[PDB]
Design a protein around this nucleic acid. Structure first.
Ligand SMILES: [Mg+2]
Ligand SMILES: [Zn+2]
Lengths: 81, 23, 62, 717, 225, 687, 224
DNA sequence: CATCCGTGAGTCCAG
């Protein structure tokens, strides 16, 4: 129970940490998906077989990181160490 | 007055009288 | 010797290392920073470095 | 957030802006896109506003003493050429605004930004990794602002009045919205004690049970309170779900609240809460009427009276030395005491003569900033001044600064002040060098495992035993026990266990072990837990920053180094002692220890001290030779009386420090063994930082010490 | 550019957003509008009351759970619209076991109670209750000492005439064109069950237009929107 | 920076230098204040850094004797009687004698008042001594201080730490567009300006024959005429503006030694390091938090805190192996839109405005005849444009710089101007900037009260007095009693008295508090100047009294009380502040640390020659340093990638930083870092 | 517990005028007069100089032969110039004077619909052989507009852009008499004070302030 | 336990 997170505080990190072993893990877990998303957009223009696109609705001009970090909150990604 | 020597604007000074020697 | 020479008394560190033919295994913080590898700590350890992320099977293109 | 100047950002995201320039066809290629940014065409100010969207940057402020010297922020474009900084992170960077500069670094790679927003963001690193205390808290204006409204002013207007005569009860309001419209008309004071019915704030834990039976308070449930309107507006920030606090907000109070919020409530609640507190403090620091005038700074009434009393006592001492009845070393040693006593009496004169309205006093006694010794020097008197030697000058400075100091007073004052500045310069150079040695000795120390599993740990004294009865909290509790994890079940007198093994010690769990009567717990330490390379997670316990178990891979070795060398500037043993220990030198003191335990045989001579020890268990007499300049240490004997100095016939344990000074740890090794010498070091190290008011958790010290014993010598090949 | 008007809702209260104001006008409009809603809107409230079984205040009314204090407070939160300026009088009598509400109130002509579900006092068996209420009209907030004057148990009550309960406002900056100087005015307004916030603002908005008319009447020289 | 700064430079006493000692060799004894330093070397003036105690300023009255020691003037006392005969004593000579303090009460003839007086003795020891034994006494109270020290009003009310900064900052003051003398002074402000040499003094008495902005011509008594030329808009060493303006009007009778035309930071011949600002000592909405400062927009609109800055840009044409560089208006592949502000030669025109990146001096050099790109050869056949052999080597405006072109200075080898061997034409272009005050600019008082401008509010947002006047500067209250510099308080009180004026009540006699007060001060005009000489001047008694004598404003209303406080209306809410706020006038200097110089940033740029790391400095368009201390913080975070990235692709990875730029503008992902080129240098250095 | 429509009285002086307004709500006067003071100082329209041009001068930083003052101090003297213009579009004044004597704001030649309200204002002390030919451009606007904006437009190398302080308001304040007597006689009496620059009247200033505010509060009455 | 030589002795900034 809190006030609506604004800007870079969203998604709330506390619920983001609950879905991952440690802080450090969450980083690579997120950035590697951000690479998949930014690959998908450049590859799609000229190449098939790209990594699956954004599993959530992208915000207008939303950064690849900010998309990834949202679907981590949506439990739509699988986690492997 | 403090330094009544050149032709300067008068700046009134709280003072004990200082007449030993000019700077 | 890399972590030692980059500390103090460098001229003494080298002379001794070159005599004993000491081989440095680049497995340390100071060692890695120099050569420009990923440091053996934090998000640089293999436990967190080699991660595979995939969409849940339930998640599918519309 | 931070304020990133529009000119700065355009150069930082220069190849990023050119990208979107050729995207939205403002430029035909990448060569032209470059010329649009360089010429600063009006288009780019729209493009740039999109580029920096939630793309974090780093703020660095030299000297980077600890890891909070670099923090991540969400950049916000701003007119002007100056970096804008959130008031709370000033404590982290140790940054004021007298012309400070900061370095900005822009993360590029996908991982770098991830590490920035997650690891290094400012709203995540609220706590000092040294003590676990809140650094991002109300500090200057904020504390004085909050301390204002939460103060209970007795006879202020609008105060609650009981009913008597023909007039009923005055001072009772139906709602906060009613009391709000009251002070607007001008009937109620925001600091006057009243009674109000509240509908959106959980009552105290002690009152919630009385009114609900812990039926579970609910947003809508009503209850009556006896506070001030100000204290209500303050609790609307904590916000709901947090038990009401009816006190005045001294800094120690606010420190506790945030610390409690740190434990229970999630991070994003704390970051959002501490933001609310900031806004409040500044708005109320404005209307707090905290002002400095020549009027508010008042010289004591008994000023000349008090000084004449001691000057008379002084002249007596002067005449008593004039007849040569006093030694020259005794004369000044007495003159020092006389004026030391005088200055105190002048300070006492201030506090009582000063109203708690007085802004100079208001700031001081509210934990906002400043000491009363400064106030004493300001309106009372400077006091004694230090000699080139460091001894206190027999002559005092009777003048306060408000009265203006005399000429020759200013001179000797100046002398000291500069030497202070001189030493302040030289210690920093040392402190920094000590820091870098520490960093290097503990770099390969990383958390590599989750648990060593060894049952080995070390005892910690929870509390002293009161002579009359009951228990007394130990003074080392917070820095030696609070963060540890247990390595053995802690049981009371009964068979009932209080806290299990593998359980993190928290604030209540200490109370559980404090009330149960148990005064000693075995806990896991970095010293004991043996692992291949570096240390385990479990042993290390609660990472002071996270408030939870340290993650696997934390560079605890470097953070420990930082946490010790960061405050190493504020010392007088002193900083040399801290070196002397860490460099394992054969000490200056060279205080001997007992090779074997037994009965003490004091046989003092005037030319030389000699101590013999008759072995408790058979054995042969062991005898030492000591110089009369040192003196016997007042050791806590079996008699439970520490103040008992060494006497013949006393009983000493093995390795017991015989005289004052310091023990050579090398002897402690051969005498008491590897484990004992590690605990001597850590506490002897701690005693230096204790004396100057610095609090480092024993954790960090142990990381360094552990690395001092990893090697054994070769006796036979 | 001409300024816009927006609204985020709730049943009893709502937030209003004004932008883009010419730089420095957020604070020029802020506090001025707040004190208007809290004081410059007329309504109807309770000036004084009278209880049958009371000769002094400390003893609670025979047969009632609540003290004398809590009932007054309960009555302060009673919302009422009287049609005539002159002071009217309503009666509320009830006996036996149960709970007395605002729906039990017997209102005069042209006088309406808007929250008949409001809790007032819990009566037990053999519990008698007879109360005389005095309803006047006015604006804002008036203390109890000013209503201290039948002296056979007359009780002065805090008069909350105003239909607006509580108002707060913040001024942030909107970035119009290249200028990040322009002000954005956020305004939170909570009203009674008597009038809607959206309406309370218009009246508070219309009221203030009348004041600035006096100045404007003289020349109506220059301004641009 | 300013006149005073130059003066202080000529009087600095250093231990550093050949034959002297090093900074590391100097222990803790050489630096601290010695007893002999009295009246010879100032105990306040010294640097704050690692140089402390090793650099000082010569005291005011002292002089140097033919043997290289420091003498100082003392008044001679024959037998309890002060004599006007003055003798200079060396340090060890003074030790053999016994000196009385300056302020010791003296008979109108010259005798002492009390038998036992305050006495200075060898080894810095002090004691009371009967008047029979007094040999000499001090010349003046302010004898121990330097020239910079003496201009700090109520100096004895500020601790040695802030007083030190107070003296070390006065040197750093910037000359303003026009300057005011301070309302509160110490008297030193006159002699300092004159001796500095950045004003214009009249050598021989006479009458102003003709005056212009350009020069002043004085007709002496004996018939001869001496003319003084005015320095107008000249660049100082530090880019500040030394601009002299005539004081006297034509036909004025002027006597010798008088100031006839003052320079920068000078009002009628007095040192004017700043402006007289209306202050308000109150916290205000957290914008003045931690020594930040709040301004009135008045100071922007009325150019109260505005200054000029002149830069000197330079470039030359040399003989090369491929020919010779020629400065011409014809620069390859440049429109006539950019060359617009050039003349036929290739130089910028006087009066033109210049922005960063714009052309100042168009010079071209012959480029080496190396085989042009086969891909560019092809591109030159299509458009049929033959390549020129001349590369653009023009002088463009450095990043950040901007302003009007206020002068060109051309030297040609052709026009017989003697140039160094190899050069032909050399151009200097001087550009001036009219920098208004802005956020981040460092302001300071004389009492070591520094700070940068936090927020500049509109003039209507300012907490204002009863008569409508909005204050100028809003200093925070918190940062006053901690620094032990309450001189700024006394300066403010006396500052209000000096602005409103005052009048002591003579009815029923002259009051007992203002009994010691000199007659001339018993009545004062609005905007009147006064002196509070250090270790003399105003006392807290006379100051409190003067607060009561404060004259009403134009509406016949007193504004501040005897406490010195006054009631303020919050310009935002409208509601008057709940408590009395200390209000008055305080002298503030614009220091030479302005954001327009301090700001810098870099995407990519030049790189080191050996280590291939980015160069360092704003002058080289360098990058920041992520030092050894800064690495530890990254490691302590666990940010392995961020740390690696900075030390690799962001730095000396030759192929990395190139392929990072490509990846960004193409909107791809960042590639994996390679090997640091600097590390490769090490392995070769070892080999 | 009383209702009375409010008044707006006036007590005059040539340059400044006190406006009296009563009877107002209790504790309402303070936050009402301020709502006016903040309007006057900031958004009252007027007219002033934007740019000038001088014979033989190319930039702000130089000296005219035979004139005691330099261009900077001259431009700094011209800031005090009080001007009113009716022409909504830019207009051009003139000033030419030679030989010995003192040039003032009087020697300025304002075209149709432009009036100088302070001729005694000292500009430059022209010594013998000193000639001064200037050319001033006046526009209409409000508040304060920095010179720096004029230059990038396309203005020739002759013109010297000068800051513009259009606000014809000088000094504004207020005081309030609140009858806090325990009765229904509780009200606030406002006394507003307005002083102008003799470019417009203290009344006409309050008129343009009101016209502005009304158009702002009118959007609080329009329906959704 | 005390001498002689070699090696340590804060950061960033500007310049
Ligand atoms: Mg600082
Ligand atoms: Zn372990």
């Amino acid at each position: 129970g809190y006030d609506t997170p604004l800007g870079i505080t969203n998604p709330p990190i506390d619920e983001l940490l609950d879905r991952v072993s440690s802080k450090y893990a969450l980083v690579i877990y997120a950035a590697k998906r951000a690479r998949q998303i930014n690959d998908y957009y450049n590859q799609l223009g000229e190449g098939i077989l790209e990594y699956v696109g954004p599993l959530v609705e992208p915000g207008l001009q939303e950064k690849p990181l900010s998309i990834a970090l949202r679907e981590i909150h949506a439990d739509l990604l699988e986690h492997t160490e | 007055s403090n330094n009544s020597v050149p032709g300067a604007p008068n700046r009134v000074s709280f003072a004990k009288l200082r007449e030993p020697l000019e700077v | 010797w890399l972590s030692a020479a980059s500390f103090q008394e460098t001229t003494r560190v080298l002379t001794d290392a070159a005599i004993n033919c000491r081989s440095d295994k680049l497995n340390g913080l100071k060692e890695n920073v120099i050569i420009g590898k990923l440091i053996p700590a934090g998000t640089g350890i293999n436990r967190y470095r080699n991660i595979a992320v995939q969409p849940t099977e339930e998640a599918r293109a519309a | 957030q931070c304020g990133l100047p529009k000119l700065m950002a355009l150069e930082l995201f220069k190849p990023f802006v050119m990208k979107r320039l050729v995207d939205l066809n403002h430029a035909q290629n990448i060569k032209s896109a470059k010329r649009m940014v360089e010429r600063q065409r009006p288009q780019v100010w729209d493009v740039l506003e999109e580029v920096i969207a939630e793309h974090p940057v780093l703020l660095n402020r030299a000297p980077t003493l600890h890891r909070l010297g670099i923090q991540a922020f969400e950049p916000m474009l701003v007119e002007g050429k100056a970096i804008q900084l959130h008031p709370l992170v000033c404590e982290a960077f140790n940054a004021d605004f007298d012309g400070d500069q900061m370095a900005v670094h822009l993360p590029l790679s996908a991982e770098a930004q991830a590490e920035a927003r997650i690891l290094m963001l400012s709203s995540n690193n609220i706590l000092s990794p040294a003590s676990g205390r809140p650094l991002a808290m109300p500090r200057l204006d904020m504390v004085t602002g909050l301390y204002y409204l939460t103060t209970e002013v007795p006879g202020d207007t609008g105060e609650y009045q009981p009913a008597s005569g023909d007039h009923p009860e005055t001072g009772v309001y139906s709602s906060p919205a009613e009391a709000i419209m009251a002070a607007d008309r001008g009937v109620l004071s925001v600091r006057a004690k009243i009674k109000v019915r509240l509908t959106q704030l959980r009552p105290p834990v002690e009152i919630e049970a009385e009114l609900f039976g812990h039926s579970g308070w609910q947003p809508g449930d009503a209850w009556m309170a006896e506070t001030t309107l100000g204290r209500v507006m303050f609790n609307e920030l904590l916000p709901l779900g947090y038990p009401f606090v009816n006190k005045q907000m001294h800094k120690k109070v606010q420190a506790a609240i945030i610390n409690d919020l740190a434990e229970r409530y999630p991070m994003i609640v704390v970051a959002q809460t501490v933001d609310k507190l900031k806004d409040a403090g500044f708005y109320w620091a404005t209307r707090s009427g905290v002002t400095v005038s020549m009027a508010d700074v008042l010289v004591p009434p008994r000023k000349k009276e008090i000084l004449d009393h001691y000057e008379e006592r002084a002249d007596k001492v002067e005449k008593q030395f004039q007849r040569g009845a006093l030694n020259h070393d005794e004369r000044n040693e007495a003159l020092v005491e006389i004026w030391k006593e005088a200055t105190d009496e002048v300070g006492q004169a201030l506090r009582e003569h000063y109203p708690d309205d007085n802004p100079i006093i208001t700031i001081v006694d509210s934990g906002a900033t400043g000491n009363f010794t400064q106030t004493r020097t300001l309106a009372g008197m400077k006091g004694l001044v230090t000699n080139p030697k460091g001894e206190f000058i027999p002559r005092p400075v009777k003048s306060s600064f408000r009265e203006g100091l005399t000429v020759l007073e200013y001179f000797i004052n100046t002398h000291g002040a500069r030497k202070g500045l001189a030493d302040t310069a030289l210690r920093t150079a040392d402190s920094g060098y000590l820091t870098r040695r520490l960093v290097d000795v503990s770099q390969d120390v990383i958390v590599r495992e989750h648990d060593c599993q060894t049952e080995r740990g070390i005892v910690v004294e929870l509390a002293e035993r009161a002579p009359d009865g009951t228990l007394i909290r130990d003074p080392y509790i917070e820095t030696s026990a609070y963060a540890r994890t247990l390595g053995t079940d802690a049981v009371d007198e009964a068979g009932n266990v209080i806290v299990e093994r593998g359980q993190d010690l928290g604030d209540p769990e200490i109370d559980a072990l404090l009330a149960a009567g148990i005064t000693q717990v075995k806990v896991r330490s970095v010293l004991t837990c043996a692992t291949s390379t570096g240390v385990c997670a479990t042993c290390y316990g609660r990472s002071m920053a996270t408030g939870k178990l340290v993650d696997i891979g934390e560079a605890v070795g470097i953070v420990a180094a930082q946490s010790i060398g960061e405050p190493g500037t504020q010392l007088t043993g002193g900083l040399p002692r801290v070196q002397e220990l860490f460099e394992a030198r054969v000490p200056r003191g060279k205080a001997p220890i007992a090779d074997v335990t037994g009965r003490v045989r004091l046989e003092d001579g005037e030319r030389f001290y000699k101590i013999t020890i008759v072995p408790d268990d058979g054995g042969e007499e062991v005898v030492y030779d000591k110089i009369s300049k040192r003196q016997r240490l007042r050791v806590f004997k079996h008699e439970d009386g520490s103040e008992r100095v060494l006497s013949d016939g006393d009983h000493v344990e093995v390795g017991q420090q015989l005289m004052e000074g310091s023990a050579d740890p090398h002897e402690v090794l051969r005498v008491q063994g590897p484990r004992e010498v590690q605990i001597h070091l850590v506490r002897e190290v701690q005693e230096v930082y204790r004396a100057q008011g610095v609090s480092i958790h024993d954790k960090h010290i142990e990381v360094i010490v552990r690395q001092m014993l990893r090697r054994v010598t070769i006796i036979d090949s | 550019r001409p300024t816009l008007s927006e609204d985020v809702l709730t049943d009893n209260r709502s937030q209003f957003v004004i932008e883009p104001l010419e730089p420095g006008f957020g604070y020029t409009l802020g506090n001025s509008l707040r004190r208007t809603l809290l004081s410059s809107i007329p309504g109807a409230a309770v000036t004084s009351i009278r209880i049958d079984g009371v000769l002094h205040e400390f003893t609670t009314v025979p047969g009632v759970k609540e003290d004398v204090t809590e009932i007054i407070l309960n009555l302060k939160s009673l919302v009422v619209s009287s049609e005539e300026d002159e002071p009217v009088t309503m009666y509320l009598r009830k006996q036996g076991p149960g709970e007395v509400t605002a729906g039990d109130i017997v209102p005069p002509a042209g006088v309406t109670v808007h929250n008949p579900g409001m809790h007032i006092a819990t009566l037990n068996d053999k519990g008698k209750l007879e109360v005389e209420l005095v309803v006047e009209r006015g604006r804002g907030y008036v203390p109890a000492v000013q209503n201290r004057a039948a002296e056979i148990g007359r009780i002065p009550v805090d008069s909350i005439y105003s239909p607006v309960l509580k108002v707060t406002y913040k001024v942030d900056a909107t970035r119009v064109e290249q200028r990040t100087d322009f002000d954005k005015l956020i305004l939170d307004v909570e009203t009674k069950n008597s009038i809607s916030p959206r309406d309370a603002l218009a009246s508070a908005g219309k009221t203030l237009v009348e004041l600035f008319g006096l100045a404007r009447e003289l020349n109506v020289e220059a301004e641009g929107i | 920076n300013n006149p005073l700064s130059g003066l202080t430079h000529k009087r600095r006493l250093s231990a550093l230098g050949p034959g002297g000692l090093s900074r590391e060799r100097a222990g803790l004894e050489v630096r601290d204040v010695h007893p002999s330093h009295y009246g010879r070397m100032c105990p306040i003036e010294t640097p704050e850094g690692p140089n402390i105690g090793l650099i000082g300023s010569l005291s005011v009255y002292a002089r140097v004797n033919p043997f290289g020691f420091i003498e100082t003037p003392y008044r001679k006392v024959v037998d309890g009687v002060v004599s006007d005969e003055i003798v200079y004593l060396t340090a060890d000579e003074e030790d053999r004698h016994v000196v009385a303090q300056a302020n010791s009460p003296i008979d109108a003839d010259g005798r002492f008042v009390e038998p036992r007086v305050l006495v200075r003795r060898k080894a810095g020891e002090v004691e009371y001594v009967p008047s029979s034994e007094v040999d000499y006494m001090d010349v003046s109270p302010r004898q121990m201080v330097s020239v910079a020290t003496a201009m700090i009003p109520f100096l004895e009310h500020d601790d040695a730490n802030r007083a030190l900064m107070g003296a070390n900052m006065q040197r750093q003051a910037v000359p303003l567009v026009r300057s005011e003398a301070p309302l509160v002074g110490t008297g030193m402000e006159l002699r300092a300006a004159i001796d500095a040499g950045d004003v214009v003094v009249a050598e021989e008495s006479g009458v102003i024959e003709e005056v212009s902005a350009d020069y002043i011509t004085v007709m002496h008594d004996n018939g001869t005429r001496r003319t003084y030329r005015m320095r107008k808009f000249a660049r100082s060493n530090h880019g500040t503006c030394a601009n002299q303006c005539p004081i006297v009007d034509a036909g004025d009778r002027v006597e010798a030694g008088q100031v006839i035309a003052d320079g920068p930071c000078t009002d009628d011949g007095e040192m004017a390091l700043g402006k007289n600002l209306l202050v308000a000592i109150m916290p205000w909405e957290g914008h003045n938090y931690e020594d930040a400062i709040i301004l009135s927009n008045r100071l922007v609109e009325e150019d109260v805190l505005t200054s000029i800055h002149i830069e000197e840009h330079e470039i030359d044409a040399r003989d090369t192996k491929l020919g010779a560089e020629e400065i011409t208006r014809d620069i390859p592949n440049i429109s006539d839109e950019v060359l617009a502000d050039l003349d036929e030669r290739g130089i910028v025109r006087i009066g033109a405005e210049v922005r960063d990146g714009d052309i100042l001096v168009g010079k071209v050099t012959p480029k080496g005849e190396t085989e042009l790109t086969p891909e560019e050869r092809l591109l030159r056949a299509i458009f049929g444009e033959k390549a020129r052999e001349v590369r653009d080597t023009s002088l463009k405006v450095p990043h950040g710089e901007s302003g009007k072109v206020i002068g060109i200075r051309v030297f040609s080898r052709e026009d017989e101007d003697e140039l160094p061997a190899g050069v032909n034409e050399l151009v200097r272009v001087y550009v001036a900037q009219k920098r208004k005050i802005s956020d981040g600019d460092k302001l300071a008082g004389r009492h070591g009260n520094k700070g940068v401008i936090g927020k500049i509010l509109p003039v209507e947002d300012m907490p204002f007095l009863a008569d409508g006047t909005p204050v100028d500067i809003i200093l925070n209250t918190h940062g006053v009693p901690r620094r032990m510099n309450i001189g700024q308080i006394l300066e403010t009180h006396l500052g209000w008295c000096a602005h409103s004026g005052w009048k002591v009540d003579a009815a029923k006699g002259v009051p007992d508090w203002a009994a010691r007060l000199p007659d001339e001060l018993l009545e004062a005009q609005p905007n009147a100047i006064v002196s509070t000489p250090v270790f003399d001047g105003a006392q807290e008694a006379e100051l409190q009294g003067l607060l009561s004598c404060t004259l009403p404003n134009r509406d016949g209303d007193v504004l501040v009380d005897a406490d010195g406080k006054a009631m303020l209306f919050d310009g935002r809410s409208g509601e008057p502040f709940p408590y009395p706020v200390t209000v008055g006038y305080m002298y503030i200097m614009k220091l030479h640390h302005l954001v327009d110089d301090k700001i810098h940033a870099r995407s990519t740029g030049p790189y080191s020659m050996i280590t291939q790391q980015p160069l360092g400095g704003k002058a080289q368009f360098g990058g920041q340093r992520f030092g050894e201390m800064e690495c530890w913080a990254m490691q302590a975070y666990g940010a392995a990638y961020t740390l690696q990235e900075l030390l690799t692709i962001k730095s000396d990875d030759t192929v990395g930083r190139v392929k990072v730029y490509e990846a960004i503008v193409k909107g791809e992902n960042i590639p994996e870092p390679g090997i640091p080129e600097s590390f490769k240098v090490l392995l070769k250095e070892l080999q």
